[PDB]
């Protein structure tokens, strides 16, 4: 079954994405004496990891690897409700297993937050929600624009375009909100670490941003 | 109307570009004790943000997202005067709103200059003008060369080519002039912060550079 | 003979890849007073070096430049056993000569480990094996997905896709295992320096990961 | 005349490349108290600047922007001797003017070496020559492989492939030799600063590497 391949692809893509990218956040200075945070390192790993997973799985599942993307696809009727529930389940499960593998292989002294996304202390949850909405909006707009079959003018790698959209979300928002853009990516390490601080914003922010982008693309700009 | 979609696209593209990219300049060490400035972080965010916005909006508006680009297009008769005034208005308005959103979500202690472009103290305004002229020249030349329909040899992503031209402008000029290349990008945070220091060079420099590049491309090299 | 060209290409590609990339690991602070380790610098050099060598030699040899890739190709019957033995020999020999050239041109005071891949002291060899398995899995999956002739949807540079897969392996795993993904790349400097610590994991980990990826791609996802 | 356009393009491409890229080397800490050297910043600026100039001028002049490339093209009979002398003149002149402009706009306190390429004190000139030979070899091989009309399999941006080859040359060799790969790029700031230390290696090394690569590509691998 093509469908079960696709669901398995979403699970595996998420597992790999989350393991590698959360892995890039590990501060090898430790919790007691943290080394400087390399924002470029993290932003590139998240962006290039998404580019790589879209390259690997785009033709098998569509390479959503993100519940907010899947929800935008449901709301624009590009995927069935039935398919969307299995994708979102696979994405959340994949994120849990990827984060769990990271936990198992990472020395306890440097695990730290295991890459959980958190709102800066000097931000409100409302401002964090807005940041996540906007960064996810631009990501989902990039996905819809890049994959639009009506276009004759798309050039170069679609996967890389999407990955660089992820990268810019991070280069801006890592210190504001952790730059989630992706409810499953936040969910995975939240489950492993039992850290649920403002967790709802990482569902509501990205999902609203994604649906707005998909809606604006499909029904306002390029119907 | 296709035209109103295009104007709205220029506004939205600028808003997102400016929010994310100015956001990358925020020094989370604060004004009292600034951490080292990561020039790669800023250069990549500006370059990849332009690449992403061109990917998203190139087919809707042409993805100028820059009054100097729009002026070069007017002077080479690629866009009408009428259209250019609405584009430039949308670009300036979008930059103001993007910078304003950044101001609202950024803790006051780290707002700093809000990414306003300023001439180094040990540079003259004249040398700043020249720097901005040259970096904008190469950017606009890249745009005209990449989009030239006569060419059969353009390979890979046009958006990424343009974004990397933005990136190199920054990797050179951030410490000289702030590497504007873009009058609206300078205008937005200037309005929010009331900081107008040498502001005219960020209009005159890029506009002259852009018109020279467009003119040289269209009428000297590739007529 | 096309075959001897291909074998010579694998040797030369490996030599250049290893010289440049191990060269990027040299800590010019010295063994006594090491400067901060730039993980981005190393990750980009390894990834972009593979992208460059695939660009240069992909059409001559297939651009494996990696015994684990070659083994995956043997197990999926994409290359003959006979050809695979000469490729693996050329790859190991090329890595030795590249690492040897690096040793000759590098001041003894900064040679350090000559970029040998080692397991972190706070990791077990088993966890190192798992890390190497997973990072090599995603790399080999990227190679099979990117080169799949059945696909009509691959966009942009195949070489760059593969290089960025290498880059993410590093951005995650440099501090865990040295991010080998490549038995020959580990073998070369091991020979020059006589450093064989946990060396077997850099054969077994990548080879298992590669065969699993090739097998899953060819027989489960995209038969 | 197409020929005079091409010569002017080589001059202008070199001017811009050298200004921006040497500009990226300026240490704003000063000669008295230098800040850490960002190798990624410099490597990306040189690589992306070449990618950008090849994008801008490849169809006008061939985008050599490098006397060693031009010599390799002469030796493989891809360009006439007559044309090669004007290209090399334009390249050297462009490099002088670009470096001179940089000197004029850069505060005297941070000019430093103006990005002159020098051999590390703990390297011999012979080892510097070898480093320059190898890094230029891989660059020129990338150019010949990327531009080979017999190939049906080249994917993505040729300009970016070449630029990333430049980038890896730097990520390896900046601290060894300054990673010239380009006699004109070394010549320009040497003229402005009157700094000729080991200057001959930056002609002989790259030229030998370039001719070997061109020769091997055209006559051994892909005749
Ligand atoms: C827009 C709807 C808002 C309803 C609140 C969601 C449920 C509350 O959930 C709580 O929210 C707090 C504030 O963010 C957080 O500090 C807690 O970690 C979280 O558990
Ligand atoms: C080439 C035309 C130059 C005319 C000067 C423009 C108007 C002056 O404007 C002023 O210029 C000063 C010098 O740059 C700046 O310091 C001030 O911030 C700016 O308000
Ligand atoms: C799965 C098969 C495991 C068999 C062990 C391989 C041969 C042992 O080899 C040794 O292994 C040690 C533990 O990694 C290392 O510390 C030594 O450096 C290595 O020589
Ligand atoms: C292979 C041919 C070598 C001949 C030497 C070239 C001319 C000498 O030139 C000198 O070489 C010295 C050693 O590199 C440098 O220290 C000097 O800066 C340079 O002027």
mmCIF file of C-alpha atoms and ligand atoms in Angstrom, chain D residues 125-126 129 196-201 204, ligand 4:
data_model
loop_
_atom_site.group_PDB
_atom_site.id
_atom_site.type_symbol
_atom_site.label_atom_id
_atom_site.label_comp_id
_atom_site.label_asym_id
_atom_site.label_seq_id
_atom_site.Cartn_x
_atom_site.Cartn_y
_atom_site.Cartn_z
ATOM 1 C CA UNK D 125 57.181 28.261 0.277
ATOM 2 C CA UNK D 126 57.331 24.789 -1.318
ATOM 3 C CA UNK D 129 53.030 26.102 -3.556
ATOM 4 C CA UNK D 196 55.356 40.792 -2.519
ATOM 5 C CA UNK D 197 56.226 38.083 0.031
ATOM 6 C CA UNK D 198 56.437 34.719 -1.770
ATOM 7 C CA UNK D 199 54.287 36.303 -4.456
ATOM 8 C CA UNK D 200 55.523 33.951 -7.196
ATOM 9 C CA UNK D 201 53.839 30.924 -5.553
ATOM 10 C CA UNK D 204 53.066 29.234 -10.259
HETATM 11 C C1 LIG E 4 60.423 26.964 -8.686
HETATM 12 C C2 LIG E 4 61.199 28.225 -9.004
HETATM 13 C C3 LIG E 4 61.659 28.932 -7.730
HETATM 14 C C4 LIG E 4 62.463 30.191 -8.052
HETATM 15 C C5 LIG E 4 62.266 31.306 -7.022
HETATM 16 C C6 LIG E 4 61.349 32.432 -7.510
HETATM 17 C C7 LIG E 4 61.956 33.830 -7.345
HETATM 18 C C8 LIG E 4 62.321 34.176 -5.899
HETATM 19 O O1 LIG E 4 61.429 35.168 -5.363
HETATM 20 C C9 LIG E 4 61.478 35.231 -3.934
HETATM 21 O O2 LIG E 4 61.233 33.924 -3.407
HETATM 22 C C10 LIG E 4 61.402 33.840 -1.995
HETATM 23 C C11 LIG E 4 61.144 32.399 -1.568
HETATM 24 O O3 LIG E 4 59.802 32.036 -1.920
HETATM 25 C C12 LIG E 4 60.426 34.787 -1.306
HETATM 26 O O4 LIG E 4 60.682 34.777 0.098
HETATM 27 C C13 LIG E 4 60.512 36.207 -1.845
HETATM 28 O O5 LIG E 4 59.446 36.976 -1.282
HETATM 29 C C14 LIG E 4 60.436 36.202 -3.372
HETATM 30 O O6 LIG E 4 60.667 37.531 -3.860
#
